[PDB]
């Protein structure tokens, strides 16, 4: 063949995924997050790898290996920062990525959406087991409290946690397996991320007005490549500003104290990007149900596609559910807050309320305001 860019077994893969790829013209800026999410990953894996090259995974060397990396390894400090803060850039993006899909009904592309849920779960795990590594008070205590949760699982419970980590409590034998796990999972993320885009590419890419784009697509590269690179910088600048001016802005100070099993800090809480669920977790008293609430707080995403009733895909022309949507983010935002606070009166209530308003907006309002919204259009 002529082109020699559309004939070669490998280039043909690229020229069909970053060039010549039919993308709708009206794609919104919300679509810039898949891109970011991907480069966000390349970045972590890089900085991480480069950072792992100076780490020691052992109760007696962990904390200082990290410290040493920062005080001794040239540009070590920067690398750690980028990696740590990057974790967040990662979640902020993955959360805006979910969003966009939730409200353009991108989720109607089931398979491409289900894998996405698997991406979120995976990206989490890798970030939980990764924060222990520095082995500071929170690293340790967070690991001990959050892992012990499985304990509620009746019968085959205690025996799981008791095997999960080392032997009897978060100690050396678990820092190791955590380090290993942390090193492995990211590559699995990338693996799956490929499957994600595959399923995607099956159908076109969805678009803001939610109606067939075939009418007029545009070559990805000439356009979207530029578009995304723009987004990359527009979003990467704050990342760095934060990473270079307030490095600890989002980091608990208590995690600057080498882990010590004889001093449980007050207010043990996982990283912000987990809070919303930490909240919904301590909403229901019965320890068991609590885990379930927690599990369901994320797993519910698998159900979203079966709760779509609107005769329309996106909700651009759906003002009612439109407020419902924002009323929802606001809700998550509140759960986050409630999670960072102690378990005391003003909170405890606002907590289980917000937590309840979470499952209703997804399980019962949305679908309902959905059909009702259809009648109003004479359907």
């Amino acid at each position: 063949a002529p082109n020699i860019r559309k004939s070669h077994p490998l280039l043909k893969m690229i020229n069909n995924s970053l060039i010549d790829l039919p993308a709708p013209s009206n794609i919104s800026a919300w679509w810039n997050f898949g891109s970011l999410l991907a480069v966000c990953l390349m970045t972590q894996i890089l900085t991480g790898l480069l950072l792992a090259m100076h780490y020691t995974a052992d109760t007696s060397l962990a904390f200082s290996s990290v410290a040493h990396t920062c005080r001794n390894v040239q540009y070590g400090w920067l690398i750690r920062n980028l990696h740590a803060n990057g974790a967040s850039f990662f979640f902020i993006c993955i959360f805006l990525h979910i969003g966009r899909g939730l409200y353009y009904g991108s989720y109607l592309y089931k398979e491409t959406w289900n894998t996405g849920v698997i991406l979120l779960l995976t990206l989490m795990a890798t970030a939980f087991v990764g924060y222990v590594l520095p082995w500071g008070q929170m690293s340790f205590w967070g690991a001990t409290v959050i892992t012990n949760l499985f304990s509620a699982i009746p019968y085959i419970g205690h025996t799981l946690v008791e095997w999960a980590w080392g032997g009897f409590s978060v100690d050396n034998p678990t820092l190791t397996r955590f380090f290993a796990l942390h090193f492995l999972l990211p590559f699995a993320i990338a693996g799956i991320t490929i499957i994600h885009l595959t399923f995607l590419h099956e159908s076109g890419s969805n678009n803001p007005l939610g109606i067939s784009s075939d009418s007029d697509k545009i070559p990805f590269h000439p356009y979207y490549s530029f578009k995304d690179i723009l987004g990359l910088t527009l979003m990467l600048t704050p990342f760095l500003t934060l990473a270079l001016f307030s490095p600890n802005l989002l980091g608990d100070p208590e995690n600057f104290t080498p882990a010590n099993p004889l001093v449980t800090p007050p207010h043990i809480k996982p990283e912000w990007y987990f809070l919303f669920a930490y909240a919904i977790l301590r909403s229901i008293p019965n320890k068991l149900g609590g885990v379930l609430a927690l599990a369901a707080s994320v797993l519910i995403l698998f159900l979203i596609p079966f709760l779509h009733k609107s005769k329309q895909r996106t909700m651009t022309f759906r003002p009612l559910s439109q407020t419902l949507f924002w009323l929802l983010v606001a809700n998550l935002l509140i759960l986050t807050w409630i999670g960072s606070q102690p378990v005391e009166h003003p909170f405890i209530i606002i907590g289980q309320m917000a937590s309840l308003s979470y499952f209703t907006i997804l399980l019962i309002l949305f679908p309902t305001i959905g059909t009702l919204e259809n009648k109003m259009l004479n359907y």
Binding site: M53, N72, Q74, G76, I79
Partner: protein
Amino acid sequence: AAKNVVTQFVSSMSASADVLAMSKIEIKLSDIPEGKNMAFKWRGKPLFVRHRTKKEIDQEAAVEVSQLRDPQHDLERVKKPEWVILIGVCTHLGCVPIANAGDFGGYYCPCHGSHYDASGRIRKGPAPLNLEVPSYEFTSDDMVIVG
């Protein structure tokens, strides 16, 4: 931007502050009088600095270079006559030679019997070469920096 980020990462690979710290060594010549051989630690290996007397000096400078397995003129191996600077590791199998001992009044490696002279030259034993001389220079009349 790229030029920087790339080179920055290409250094977080290079030897770190804690290592470069043990890179060079300062030795006070005046605390090592004539006749005795002093042992120091440098790059994890022993560093030999000996002050030579007439007996040690002269006996070493007269023998022929083309007669040695490692042909070397001691005066082509040294900066100052009263000063000997050697890597404390035998060229045979990585062992440590002994001060004030041997058939040649310099150093002798007990692992497989390598004998060296007060110039650090191989005389007895399978040792393929003379004890290695580290890269260096002098800082003053009583100071010396190796590395």
